[PDB]
Coordinates of C-alpha atoms and ligand atoms in Angstrom, one line a residue:
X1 CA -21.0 -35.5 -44.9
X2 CA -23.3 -37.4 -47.6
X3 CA -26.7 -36.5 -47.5
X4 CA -27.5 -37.0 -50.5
X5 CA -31.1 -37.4 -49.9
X6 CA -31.5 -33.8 -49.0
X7 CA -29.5 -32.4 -52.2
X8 CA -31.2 -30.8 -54.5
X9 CA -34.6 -30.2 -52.6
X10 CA -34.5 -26.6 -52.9
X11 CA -36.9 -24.8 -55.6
X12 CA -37.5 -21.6 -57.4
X13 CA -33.7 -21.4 -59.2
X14 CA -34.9 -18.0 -60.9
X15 CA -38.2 -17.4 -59.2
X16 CA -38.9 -15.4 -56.0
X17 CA -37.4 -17.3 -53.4
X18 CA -36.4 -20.5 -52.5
X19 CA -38.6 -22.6 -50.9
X20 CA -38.5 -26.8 -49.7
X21 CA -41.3 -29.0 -49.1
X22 CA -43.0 -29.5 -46.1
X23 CA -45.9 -31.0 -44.9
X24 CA -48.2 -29.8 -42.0
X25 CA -50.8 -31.8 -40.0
X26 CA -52.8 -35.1 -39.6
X27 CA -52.7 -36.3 -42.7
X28 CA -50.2 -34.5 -43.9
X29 CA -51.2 -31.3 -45.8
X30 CA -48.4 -29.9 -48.7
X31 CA -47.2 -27.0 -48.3
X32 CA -43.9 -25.5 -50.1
X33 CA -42.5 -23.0 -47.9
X34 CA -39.8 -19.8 -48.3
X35 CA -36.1 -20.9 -46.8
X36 CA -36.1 -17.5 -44.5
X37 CA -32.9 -16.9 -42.5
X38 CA -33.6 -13.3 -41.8
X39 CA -36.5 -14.1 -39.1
X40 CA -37.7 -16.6 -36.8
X41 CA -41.5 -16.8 -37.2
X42 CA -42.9 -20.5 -39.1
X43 CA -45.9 -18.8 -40.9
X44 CA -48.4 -20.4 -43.7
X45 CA -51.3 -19.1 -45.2
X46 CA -54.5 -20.7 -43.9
X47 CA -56.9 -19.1 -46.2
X48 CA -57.8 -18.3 -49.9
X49 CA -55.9 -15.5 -51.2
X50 CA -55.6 -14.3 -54.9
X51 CA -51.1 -15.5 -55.0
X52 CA -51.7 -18.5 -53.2
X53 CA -52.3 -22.0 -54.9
X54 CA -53.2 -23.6 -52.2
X55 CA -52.9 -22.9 -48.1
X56 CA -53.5 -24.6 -44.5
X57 CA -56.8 -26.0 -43.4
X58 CA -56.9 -26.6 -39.9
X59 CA -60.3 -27.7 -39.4
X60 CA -58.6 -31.0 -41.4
X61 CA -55.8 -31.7 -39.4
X62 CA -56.1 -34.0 -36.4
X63 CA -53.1 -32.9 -34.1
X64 CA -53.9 -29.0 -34.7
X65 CA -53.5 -27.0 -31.3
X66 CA -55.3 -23.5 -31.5
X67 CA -53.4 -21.3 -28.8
X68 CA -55.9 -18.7 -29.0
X69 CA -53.3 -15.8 -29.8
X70 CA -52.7 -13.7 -32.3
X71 CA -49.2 -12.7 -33.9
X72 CA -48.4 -9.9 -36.0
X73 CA -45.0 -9.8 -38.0
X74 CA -43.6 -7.2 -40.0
X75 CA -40.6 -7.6 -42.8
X76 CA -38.7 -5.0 -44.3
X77 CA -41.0 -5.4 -47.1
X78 CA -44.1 -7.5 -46.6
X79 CA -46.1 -8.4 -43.1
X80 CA -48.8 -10.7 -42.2
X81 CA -51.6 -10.8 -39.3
X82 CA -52.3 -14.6 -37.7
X83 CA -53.7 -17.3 -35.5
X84 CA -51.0 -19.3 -33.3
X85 CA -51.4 -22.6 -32.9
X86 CA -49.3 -25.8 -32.6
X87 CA -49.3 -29.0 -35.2
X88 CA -47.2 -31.8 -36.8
X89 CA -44.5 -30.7 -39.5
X90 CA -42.6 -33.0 -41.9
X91 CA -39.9 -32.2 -44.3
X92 CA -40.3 -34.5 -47.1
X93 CA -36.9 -34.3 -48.6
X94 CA -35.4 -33.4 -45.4
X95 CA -34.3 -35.7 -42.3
X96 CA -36.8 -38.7 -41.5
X97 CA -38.6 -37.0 -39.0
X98 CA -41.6 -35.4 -37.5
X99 CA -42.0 -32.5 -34.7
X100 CA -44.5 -30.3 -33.2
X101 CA -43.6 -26.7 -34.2
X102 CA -45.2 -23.6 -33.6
X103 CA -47.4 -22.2 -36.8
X104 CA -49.1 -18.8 -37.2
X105 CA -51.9 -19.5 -39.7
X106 CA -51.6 -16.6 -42.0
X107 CA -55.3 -14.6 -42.2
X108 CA -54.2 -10.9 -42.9
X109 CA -51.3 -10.3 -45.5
X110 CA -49.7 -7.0 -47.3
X111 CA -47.1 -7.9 -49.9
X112 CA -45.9 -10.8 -48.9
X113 CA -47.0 -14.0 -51.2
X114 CA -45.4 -13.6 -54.3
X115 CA -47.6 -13.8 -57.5
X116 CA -46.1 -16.9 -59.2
X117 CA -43.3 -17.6 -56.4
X118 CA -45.2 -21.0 -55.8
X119 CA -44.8 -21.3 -51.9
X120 CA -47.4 -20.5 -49.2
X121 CA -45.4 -20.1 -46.2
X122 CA -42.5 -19.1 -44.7
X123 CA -39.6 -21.0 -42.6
X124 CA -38.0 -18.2 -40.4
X125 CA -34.8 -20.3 -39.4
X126 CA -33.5 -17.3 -37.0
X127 CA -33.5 -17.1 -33.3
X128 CA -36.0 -16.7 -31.1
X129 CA -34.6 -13.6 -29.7
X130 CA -36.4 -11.4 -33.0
X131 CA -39.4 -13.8 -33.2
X132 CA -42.8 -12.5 -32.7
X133 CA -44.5 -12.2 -30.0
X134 CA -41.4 -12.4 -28.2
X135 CA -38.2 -14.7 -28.0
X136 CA -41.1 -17.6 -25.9
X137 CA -42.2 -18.8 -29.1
X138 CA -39.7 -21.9 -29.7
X139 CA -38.9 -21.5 -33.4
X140 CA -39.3 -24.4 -35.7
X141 CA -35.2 -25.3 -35.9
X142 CA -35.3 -25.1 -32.4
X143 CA -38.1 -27.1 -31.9
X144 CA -36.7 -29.9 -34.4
X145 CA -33.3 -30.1 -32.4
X146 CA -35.0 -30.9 -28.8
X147 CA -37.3 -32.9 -30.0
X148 CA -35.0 -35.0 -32.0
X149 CA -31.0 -36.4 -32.8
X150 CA -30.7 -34.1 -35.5
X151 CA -27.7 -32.1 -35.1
X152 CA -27.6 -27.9 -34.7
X153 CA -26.5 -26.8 -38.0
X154 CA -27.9 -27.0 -41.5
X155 CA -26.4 -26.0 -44.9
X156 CA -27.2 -23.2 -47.8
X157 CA -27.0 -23.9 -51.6
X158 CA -29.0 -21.1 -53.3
X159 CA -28.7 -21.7 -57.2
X160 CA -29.1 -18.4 -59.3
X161 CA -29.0 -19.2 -63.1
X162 CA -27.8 -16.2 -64.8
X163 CA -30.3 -16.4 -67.3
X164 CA -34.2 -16.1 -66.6
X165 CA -36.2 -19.2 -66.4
X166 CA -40.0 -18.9 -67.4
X167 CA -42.6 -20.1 -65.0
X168 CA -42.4 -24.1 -65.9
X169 CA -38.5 -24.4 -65.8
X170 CA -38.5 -22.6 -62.0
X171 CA -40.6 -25.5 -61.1
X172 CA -38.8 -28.3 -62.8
X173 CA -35.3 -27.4 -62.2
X174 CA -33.3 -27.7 -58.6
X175 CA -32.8 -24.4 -57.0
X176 CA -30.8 -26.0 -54.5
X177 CA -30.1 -27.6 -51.6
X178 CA -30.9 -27.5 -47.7
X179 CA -28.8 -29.7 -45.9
X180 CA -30.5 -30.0 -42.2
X181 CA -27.9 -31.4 -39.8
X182 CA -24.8 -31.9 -42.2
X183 CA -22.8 -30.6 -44.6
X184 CA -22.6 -32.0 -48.3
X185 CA -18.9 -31.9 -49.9
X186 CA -20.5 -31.9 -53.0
X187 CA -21.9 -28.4 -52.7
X188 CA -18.9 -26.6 -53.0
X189 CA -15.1 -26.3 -53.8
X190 CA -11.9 -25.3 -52.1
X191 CA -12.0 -24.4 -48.3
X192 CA -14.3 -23.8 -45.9
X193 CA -13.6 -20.5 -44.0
X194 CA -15.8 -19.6 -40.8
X195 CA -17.1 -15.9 -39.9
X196 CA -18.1 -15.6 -35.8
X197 CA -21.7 -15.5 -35.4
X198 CA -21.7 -12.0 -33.2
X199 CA -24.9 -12.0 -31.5
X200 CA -27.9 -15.0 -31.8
X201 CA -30.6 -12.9 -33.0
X202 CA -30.5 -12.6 -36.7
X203 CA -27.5 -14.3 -38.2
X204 CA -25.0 -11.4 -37.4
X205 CA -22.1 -11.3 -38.2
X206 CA -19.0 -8.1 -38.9
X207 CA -17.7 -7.2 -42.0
X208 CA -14.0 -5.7 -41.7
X209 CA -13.4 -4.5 -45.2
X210 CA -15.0 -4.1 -48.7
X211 CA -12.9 -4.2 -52.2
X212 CA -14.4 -3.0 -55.5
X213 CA -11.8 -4.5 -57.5
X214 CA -9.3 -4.6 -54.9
X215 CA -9.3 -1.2 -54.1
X216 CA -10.3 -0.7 -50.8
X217 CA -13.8 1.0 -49.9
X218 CA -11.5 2.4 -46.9
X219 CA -14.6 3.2 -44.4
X220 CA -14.3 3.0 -41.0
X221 CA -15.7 -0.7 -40.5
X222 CA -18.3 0.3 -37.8
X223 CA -20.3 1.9 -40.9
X224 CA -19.9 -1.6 -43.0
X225 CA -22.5 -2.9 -40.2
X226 CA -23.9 0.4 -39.0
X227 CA -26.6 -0.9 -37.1
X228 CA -25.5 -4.7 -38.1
X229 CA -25.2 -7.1 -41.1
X230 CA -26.6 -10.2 -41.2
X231 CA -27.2 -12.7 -43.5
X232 CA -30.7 -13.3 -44.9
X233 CA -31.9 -16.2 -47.4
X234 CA -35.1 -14.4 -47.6
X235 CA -33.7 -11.3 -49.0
X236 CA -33.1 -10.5 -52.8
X237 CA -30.2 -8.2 -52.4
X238 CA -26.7 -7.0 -51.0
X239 CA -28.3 -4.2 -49.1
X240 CA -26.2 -1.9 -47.7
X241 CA -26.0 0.8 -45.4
X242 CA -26.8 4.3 -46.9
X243 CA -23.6 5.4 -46.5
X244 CA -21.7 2.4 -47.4
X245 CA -23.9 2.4 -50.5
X246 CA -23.2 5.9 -51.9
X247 CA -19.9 4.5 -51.9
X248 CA -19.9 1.1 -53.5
X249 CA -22.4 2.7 -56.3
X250 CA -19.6 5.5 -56.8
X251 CA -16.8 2.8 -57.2
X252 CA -18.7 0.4 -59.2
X253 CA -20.0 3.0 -61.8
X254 CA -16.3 4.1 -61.9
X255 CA -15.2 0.7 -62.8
X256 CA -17.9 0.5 -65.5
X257 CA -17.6 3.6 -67.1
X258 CA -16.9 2.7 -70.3
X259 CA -21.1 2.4 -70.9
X260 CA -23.3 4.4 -69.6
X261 CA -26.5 3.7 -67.8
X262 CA -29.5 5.2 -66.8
X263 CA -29.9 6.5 -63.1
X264 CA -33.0 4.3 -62.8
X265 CA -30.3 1.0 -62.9
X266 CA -28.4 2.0 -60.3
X267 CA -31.4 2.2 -58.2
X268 CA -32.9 -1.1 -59.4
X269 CA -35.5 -0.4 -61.1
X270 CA -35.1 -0.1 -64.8
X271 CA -33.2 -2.7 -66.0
X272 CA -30.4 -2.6 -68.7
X273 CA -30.2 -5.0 -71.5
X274 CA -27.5 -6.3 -74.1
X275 CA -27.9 -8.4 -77.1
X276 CA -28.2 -12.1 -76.2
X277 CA -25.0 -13.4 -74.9
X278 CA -22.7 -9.8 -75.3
X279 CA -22.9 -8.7 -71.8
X280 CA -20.0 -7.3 -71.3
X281 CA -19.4 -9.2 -67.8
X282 CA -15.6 -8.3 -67.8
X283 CA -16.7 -4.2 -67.0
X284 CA -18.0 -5.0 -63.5
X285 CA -15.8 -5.4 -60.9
X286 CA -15.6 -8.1 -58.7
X287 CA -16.9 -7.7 -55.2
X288 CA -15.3 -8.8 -51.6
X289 CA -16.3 -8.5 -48.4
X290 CA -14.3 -9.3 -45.6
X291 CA -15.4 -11.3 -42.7
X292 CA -13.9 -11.7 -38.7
X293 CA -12.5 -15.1 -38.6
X294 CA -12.6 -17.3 -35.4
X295 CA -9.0 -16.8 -35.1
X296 CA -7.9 -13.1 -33.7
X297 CA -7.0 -10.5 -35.6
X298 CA -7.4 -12.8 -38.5
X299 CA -10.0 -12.5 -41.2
X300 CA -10.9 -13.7 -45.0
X301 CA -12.5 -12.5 -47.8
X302 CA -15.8 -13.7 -50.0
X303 CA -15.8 -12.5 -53.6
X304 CA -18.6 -11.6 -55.7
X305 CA -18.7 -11.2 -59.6
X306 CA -21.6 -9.3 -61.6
X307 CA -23.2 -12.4 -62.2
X308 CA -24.1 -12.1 -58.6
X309 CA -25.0 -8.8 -58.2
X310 CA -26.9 -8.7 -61.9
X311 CA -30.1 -10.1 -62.2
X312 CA -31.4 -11.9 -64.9
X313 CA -34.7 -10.6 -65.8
X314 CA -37.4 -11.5 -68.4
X315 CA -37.0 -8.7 -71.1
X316 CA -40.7 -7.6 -72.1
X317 CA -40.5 -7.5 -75.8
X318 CA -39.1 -11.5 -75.8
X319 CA -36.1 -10.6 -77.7
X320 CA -33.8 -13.0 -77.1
X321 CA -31.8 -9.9 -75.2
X322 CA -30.7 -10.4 -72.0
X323 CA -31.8 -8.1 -69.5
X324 CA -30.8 -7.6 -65.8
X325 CA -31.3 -5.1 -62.9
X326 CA -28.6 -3.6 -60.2
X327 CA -29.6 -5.6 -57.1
X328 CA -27.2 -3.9 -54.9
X329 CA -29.3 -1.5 -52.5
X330 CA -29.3 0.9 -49.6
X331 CA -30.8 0.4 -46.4
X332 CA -31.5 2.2 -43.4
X333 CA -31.6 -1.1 -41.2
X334 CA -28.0 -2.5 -41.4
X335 CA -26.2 -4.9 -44.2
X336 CA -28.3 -7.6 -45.6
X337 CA -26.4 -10.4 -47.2
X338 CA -29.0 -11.8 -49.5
X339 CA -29.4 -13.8 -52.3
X340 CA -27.3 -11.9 -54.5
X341 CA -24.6 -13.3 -51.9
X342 CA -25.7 -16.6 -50.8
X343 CA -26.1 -17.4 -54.9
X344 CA -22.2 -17.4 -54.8
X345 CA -21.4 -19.5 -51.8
X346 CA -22.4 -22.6 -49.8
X347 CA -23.0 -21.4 -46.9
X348 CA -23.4 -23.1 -43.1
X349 CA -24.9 -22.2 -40.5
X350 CA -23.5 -24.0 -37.5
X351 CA -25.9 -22.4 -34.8
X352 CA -23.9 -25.2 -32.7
X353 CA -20.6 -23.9 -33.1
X354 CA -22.2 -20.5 -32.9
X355 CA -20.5 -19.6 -36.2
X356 CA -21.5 -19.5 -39.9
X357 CA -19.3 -20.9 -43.0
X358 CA -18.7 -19.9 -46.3
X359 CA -17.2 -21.7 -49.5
X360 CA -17.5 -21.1 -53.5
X361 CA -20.7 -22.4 -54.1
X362 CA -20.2 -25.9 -56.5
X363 CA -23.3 -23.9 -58.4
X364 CA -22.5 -20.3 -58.9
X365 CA -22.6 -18.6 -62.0
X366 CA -19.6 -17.0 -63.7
X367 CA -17.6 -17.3 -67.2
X368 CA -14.3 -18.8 -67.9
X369 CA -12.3 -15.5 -66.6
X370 CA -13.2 -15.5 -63.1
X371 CA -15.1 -17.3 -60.8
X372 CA -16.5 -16.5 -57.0
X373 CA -13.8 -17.4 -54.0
X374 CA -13.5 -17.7 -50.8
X375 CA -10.3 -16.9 -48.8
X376 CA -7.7 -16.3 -46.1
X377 CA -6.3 -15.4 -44.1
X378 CA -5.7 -11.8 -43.7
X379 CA -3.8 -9.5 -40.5
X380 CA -5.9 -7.0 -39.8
X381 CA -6.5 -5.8 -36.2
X382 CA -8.9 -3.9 -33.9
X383 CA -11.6 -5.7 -35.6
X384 CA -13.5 -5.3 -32.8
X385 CA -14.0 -1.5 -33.2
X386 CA -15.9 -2.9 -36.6
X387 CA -19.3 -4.1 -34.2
X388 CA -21.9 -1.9 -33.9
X389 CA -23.4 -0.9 -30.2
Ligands
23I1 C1 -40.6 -13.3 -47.6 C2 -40.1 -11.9 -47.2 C3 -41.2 -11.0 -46.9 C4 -39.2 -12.1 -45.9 C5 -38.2 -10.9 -45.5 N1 -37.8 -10.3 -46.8 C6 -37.8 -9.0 -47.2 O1 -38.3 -8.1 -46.4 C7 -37.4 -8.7 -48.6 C8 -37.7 -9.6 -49.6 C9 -37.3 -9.4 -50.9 C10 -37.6 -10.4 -52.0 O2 -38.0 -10.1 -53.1 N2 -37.4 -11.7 -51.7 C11 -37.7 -12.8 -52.6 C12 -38.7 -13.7 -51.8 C13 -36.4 -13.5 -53.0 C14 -35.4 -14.0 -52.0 C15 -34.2 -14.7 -52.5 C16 -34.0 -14.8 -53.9 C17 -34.9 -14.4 -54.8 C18 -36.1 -13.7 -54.4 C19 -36.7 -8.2 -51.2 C20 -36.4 -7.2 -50.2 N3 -35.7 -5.9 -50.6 C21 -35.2 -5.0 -49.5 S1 -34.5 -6.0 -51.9 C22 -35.2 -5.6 -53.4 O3 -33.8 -7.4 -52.0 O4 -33.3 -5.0 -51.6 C23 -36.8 -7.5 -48.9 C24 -37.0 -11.2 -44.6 O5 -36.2 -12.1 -45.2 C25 -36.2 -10.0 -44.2 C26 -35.8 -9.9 -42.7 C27 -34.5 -9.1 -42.7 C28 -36.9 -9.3 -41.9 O6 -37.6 -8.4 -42.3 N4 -37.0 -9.8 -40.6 C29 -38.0 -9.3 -39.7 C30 -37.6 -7.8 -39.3 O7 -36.4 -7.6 -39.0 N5 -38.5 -6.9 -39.2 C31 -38.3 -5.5 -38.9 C32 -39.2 -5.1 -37.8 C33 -38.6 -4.6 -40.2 C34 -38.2 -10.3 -38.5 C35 -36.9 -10.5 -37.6 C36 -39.3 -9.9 -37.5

């Protein structure tokens, strides 16, 4: 697996997001656009708008297809209005190819460019089954495997930094990489270990157990994906269900209670801040989650540290201090494996073995007393019972 061509052509290391290249239309318009694995809609903006640099001009593409139909998609935070329509898309820094996908020109949006992210659109790499309208709209990765030799996988490398990056060092600086097709040795250490994709509609998957520093969360596993739990590159956070949440945040400020914080930090929004370089990293436990493996009644484990689940963010008052906010949250919608997740592993999505892979990301952050991991296997059974219905 060398594909070295694609390595390193992810962007926004501490921005909001990752995006990758792309290039839309006859000639090729330039478009840098948000790695999404959490949907399944391809989505630009097509028209001035106050966070966008630049967006998609169809009147200037030759091999634009106007379907005359309108599409409508709503996020979990953020949703856009649109025009469907058909065109040429290129990925630069991807394979050496070309295919006609399916792209809603964005028109209408409520909080969904990010001021200063530096991408226009939006790459939902999920499957058809949650795309909008409904599951006939062929998504792009879909598109790109029938209409070329490109294998049915690709490959996650989301590169957090651990220390904020100011707006010209997001955008000269490799956030990562997005291996379409393969898998790149490089991008990570030890083994491999592969988690059953449960259903093809979002990236689902069951979680069997969680640890806050070993000690079991002891739930019964159907609330650990009460509703489901999927994996999402477009997401920020480890969101978890309300439930499961109350009881993580309980643990973890038990492990940390040494220092106090502020209510607000638990729930992400004031952040907390040390003098530069004595944050006391060792306080925080260590997070696992345990995953179904392909074998029965056999599972692993993916560890977290702080440096995952603590963002760096820009203190205002410059001080060299560093600053960071809680980015574990609640939801109401199921477990979200976000960024704060993916940051820590290299993660494949083999949509052809209908299963997704993790292993200690050859870029995660940590110090020299521990480090991410990755492993297995475990004898646990009943792991069915875990699945929500
Ligand atoms: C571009 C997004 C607008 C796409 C969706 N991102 C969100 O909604 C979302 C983005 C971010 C956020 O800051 N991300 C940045 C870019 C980011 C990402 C990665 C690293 C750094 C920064 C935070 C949250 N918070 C909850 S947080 C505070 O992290 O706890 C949520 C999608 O990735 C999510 C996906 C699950 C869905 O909403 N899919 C749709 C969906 O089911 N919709 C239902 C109907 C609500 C789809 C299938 C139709």
């Amino acid at each position: 697996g060398s594909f070295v061509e694609m390595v390193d052509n992810l962007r926004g290391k501490s921005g909001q997001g990752y995006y990758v290249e792309m290039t839309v239309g006859s000639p090729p318009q330039t478009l840098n656009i948000l790695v999404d694995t959490g949907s399944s809609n391809f989505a630009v903006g097509a028209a001035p708008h106050p966070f966008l640099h630049r967006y998609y001009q169809r009147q200037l593409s030759s091999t634009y297809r106007d379907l005359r139909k309108g599409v409508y998609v709503p996020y979990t935070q953020g949703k856009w209005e649109g025009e469907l329509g058909t065109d040429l898309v290129s990925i630069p820094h991807g394979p050496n190819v070309t295919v006609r996908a399916n792209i809603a020109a964005i028109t209408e949006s409520d909080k969904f460019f990010i001021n200063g992210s530096n991408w226009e659109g939006i790459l939902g790499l999920a499957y058809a089954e949650i795309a909008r309208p409904d599951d006939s709209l062929e998504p792009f990765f879909d598109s790109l495997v029938k209409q070329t030799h490109v294998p049915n996988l690709f490959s996650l490398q989301l590169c957090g930094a651990g220390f904020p990056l100011n707006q010209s060092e997001v955008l000269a600086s490799v956030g990562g990489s997005m291996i379409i097709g393969g898998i790149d040795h490089s991008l990570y250490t030890g083994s491999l270990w592969y988690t059953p994709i449960r259903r093809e509609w979002y990236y689902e998957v069951i979680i069997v157990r969680v640890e806050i520093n070993g000690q079991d969360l002891k739930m019964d596993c159907k609330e650990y994906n009460y509703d489901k739990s999927i994996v999402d590159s477009g997401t920020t956070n480890l969101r978890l269900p309300k439930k499961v949440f109350e009881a993580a945040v309980k643990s973890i400020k038990a492990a940390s209670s040494t220092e106090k914080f502020p209510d607000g930090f638990w729930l992400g929004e004031q952040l907390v801040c040390w003098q530069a370089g004595t944050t006391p990293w060792n306080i925080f436990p260590v997070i696992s989650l345990y995953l179904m493996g392909e074998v029965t009644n056999q599972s692993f484990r993916i560890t977290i540290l702080p440096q995952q689940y603590l963002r760096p963010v820009e203190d205002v008052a410059t001080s060299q201090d560093d600053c960071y906010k809680f980015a574990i949250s609640q939801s109401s919608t199921g477990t979200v494996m976000g960024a704060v997740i993916m940051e820590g592993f290299y993660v494949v999505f083999d949509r052809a073995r209908k299963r997704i892979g993790f292993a200690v990301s050859a870029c995660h952050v940590h110090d020299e007393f521990r480090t991410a991991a990755v492993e297995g296997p475990f004898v646990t059974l009943d792991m069915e019972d875990c699945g929500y219905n």
